[PDB]
Amino acid sequence: SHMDRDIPLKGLLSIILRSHRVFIGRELGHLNLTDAQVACLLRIHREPGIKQDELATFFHVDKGTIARTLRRLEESGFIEREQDPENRRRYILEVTRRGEEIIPLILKVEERWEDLLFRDFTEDERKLFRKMCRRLAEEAVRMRGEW
Amino acid sequence: DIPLKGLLSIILRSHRVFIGRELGHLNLTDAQVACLLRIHREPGIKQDELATFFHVDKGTIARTLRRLEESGFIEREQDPENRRRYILEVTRRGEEIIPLILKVEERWEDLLFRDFTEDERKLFRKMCRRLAEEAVRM
Ligand SMILES: O=C(O)c1ccccc1O
Ligand SMILES: O=C(O)c1ccccc1O
Ligand code: NA
Ligand code: NA
Ligand code: NA
Ligand code: NA
Ligand code: NA
Ligand code: NA
């Protein structure tokens, strides 16, 4: 019934992220959206003009994988993909008017997911966990840079 | 700001990249290392019990296990009381790389917590466990 105190950090993070992928599917699956697509959408939303290959590098996924996810968003009309004028083989990405309209819907699902996850967490604990997460995300980025 | 999930994805992503660098030469992935370690902790564990443990689909666990047995790290035997069931065991070869795998996991955590004190480190870990148990309920 209870969880092993054995599981390494990565395992627990995987469990948490696991439920988020499931939550996204159930809450936005009918809009033909997946966690990966949502990930790309938000990332592009926060940085219009970002290149497909840069998105590939950020998520550390291969070309085909990123292309397939980006292809579904474009098909849904949420993003537009254009050839980079300075390099015809690169693709500049942008969230469309339509895509910007669902961003809010996505943020609400994230908010609800977070409230559900921090059910047993006090206000102080939650803000502290978040603060710790940021510090660690910052460390992970340093690590990618170290190697 | 960035959703919580974004921060956790970023963190978990460095672990995925780290395993590739440290164990890629063994064609091992995050999923494979995880299964391999769990089987090592629970010899004779059932394939379906492993899938229920990770909260992953039967098809996914199966593809991950095929990778491990193809590399010779694990062996599968039909469950003696249900031939449509498989029981898992780490092989001699698999047991040879476990220590290396454990050192790698340990080193990823130490790298991530380099600017964390022992206590913050313990707390963060405790909270993740709490959030994880909740995730299971949800
Ligand atoms: O899921 C992510 O990786 C992500 C990254 C940046 C911003 C929002 C996100 O959901
Ligand atoms: O994503 C995981 O964490 C995972 C773990 C064990 C087996 C298959 C998997 O995809
Ligand atoms: Na954009
Ligand atoms: Na997708
Ligand atoms: Na590109
Ligand atoms: Na538009
Ligand atoms: Na979130
Ligand atoms: Na794999």
From TrEMBL, chain A:
Give the record's keywords alphabetically: DNA-binding, Transcription, Transcription regulation
* One GO MF term attached to the UniProt entry: DNA-binding transcription factor activity
Q: Which domain of life is it from?
A: Archaea
Q: Entry's SMART domains?
A: HTH_MARR
Where is the chain membrane-spanning? none
Question: Residue limits of the HTH marR-type domain?
Answer: 6-138
| Pfam families xrefs | MarR
Q: Does the keyword Transcription regulation apply?
A: yes
PANTHER family (UniProt xref)? TRANSCRIPTIONAL REGULATOR, MARR (PTHR42756), TRANSCRIPTIONAL REPRESSOR OF EMRAB OPERON (PTHR42756:SF1)
Q: What is this protein called?
A: Transcriptional regulator
Q: Where is the organism placed in the taxonomic lineage, from the top?
A: Archaea, Methanobacteriati, Methanobacteriota, Methanomada group, Methanobacteria
